[PDB]
Ligand binder design. Structure first.
Ligand SMILES: *C(=O)[C@@H](NC(=O)Cc1ccccc1)[C@@H]1N[C@@H](C(=O)O)C(C)(C)S1
Length: 242
């Protein structure tokens, strides 16, 4: 009822054929040129739950409040059998991000009061800002963000001379690196919502030798999967600027 699509106004694109039988949007931002590039402006402004992309923010708050740190991003397994075998071991930040280990981020969340989080979501302009009963509010629930916001918000949280330390930003960055060769480094995080897949995400950024870009892809129908959002994301960055 209070849910609304992203209002704040700020070049656009046609990637309709890469998306094919999936539907959703793409957003990109050039540091050097200070401009946005968007495929599907209207869909890009619709608010969806960020699901596992919110781990970015959970990690950042975890490092800020010290809940986890340089040396002790650790946290033990509760010896509960989850389907993913990568989830069934000791974790650190890199491991839990790479492998999107829900229990690790949920334990960070456990230790964070609604008022630090609400304050943070307000400084950051994180969508909705709608926390719930404040449980797993990021996992298909009250909290919601648009694809466009994902990009502005992430770019602003990392680039603004702001209260998060360069060091926690850098540990986060490490946790999110996905590909690297000579030309580029690609960073980001997959999100997959569910008995059905209906909300797929891939949010991140790429550093080349020349420029630095933040981008995000959402998926709502077709095969809205974190996996497919990453593929689409990769085909767009390739077919555009190496
Ligand atoms: C984050 O998106 C996680 N998704 C789920 O656990 C599914 C789910 C269940 C209940 C509520 C909301 C979402 C992990 N992220 C993805 C991903 O990285 O694409 C996985 C499917 C790997 S699990």
């Amino acid at each position: 009822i209070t849910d609304y699509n992203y209002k704040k106004p700020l070049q656009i694109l046609d990637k309709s054929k890469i998306f094919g039988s999936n539907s959703g949007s793409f957003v990109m931002y050039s540091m050097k040129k200070d401009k946005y590039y968007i495929y599907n402006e209207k869909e890009s402004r619709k608010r969806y739950s960020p699901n596992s992309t919110y781990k970015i923010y959970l990690a950042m708050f975890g490092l800020d409040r010290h809940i986890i740190n340089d040396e002790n991003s650790r946290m033990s397994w509760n010896h509960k059998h989850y389907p993913f075998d990568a989830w069934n071991k000791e974790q650190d930040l890199n491991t839990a991000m790479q492998n999107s280990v829900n229990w690790y981020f949920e334990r960070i969340s456990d230790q964070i009061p609604k008022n630090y989080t609400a304050t943070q979501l307000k400084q950051l302009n994180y969508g909705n800002k709608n926390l719930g009963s404040y449980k797993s509010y990021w996992m298909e629930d009250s909290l919601k963000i648009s694809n466009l916001e994902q990009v502005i918000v992430f770019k602003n949280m990392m680039e603004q001379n702001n209260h998060f330390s360069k060091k926690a930003k850098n540990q986060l960055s490490s946790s999110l690196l996905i590909k690297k060769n000579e030309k580029y480094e690609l960073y980001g995080k997959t999100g997959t919502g569910i008995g059905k897949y209906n909300n797929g995400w891939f949010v991140g950024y790429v550093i080349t030798n020349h420029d630095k870009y933040y981008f995000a892809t959402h998926l709502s129908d077709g095969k809205p999967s974190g996996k497919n959002a990453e593929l689409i994301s990769e085909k767009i960055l390739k077919e555009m600027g190496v």
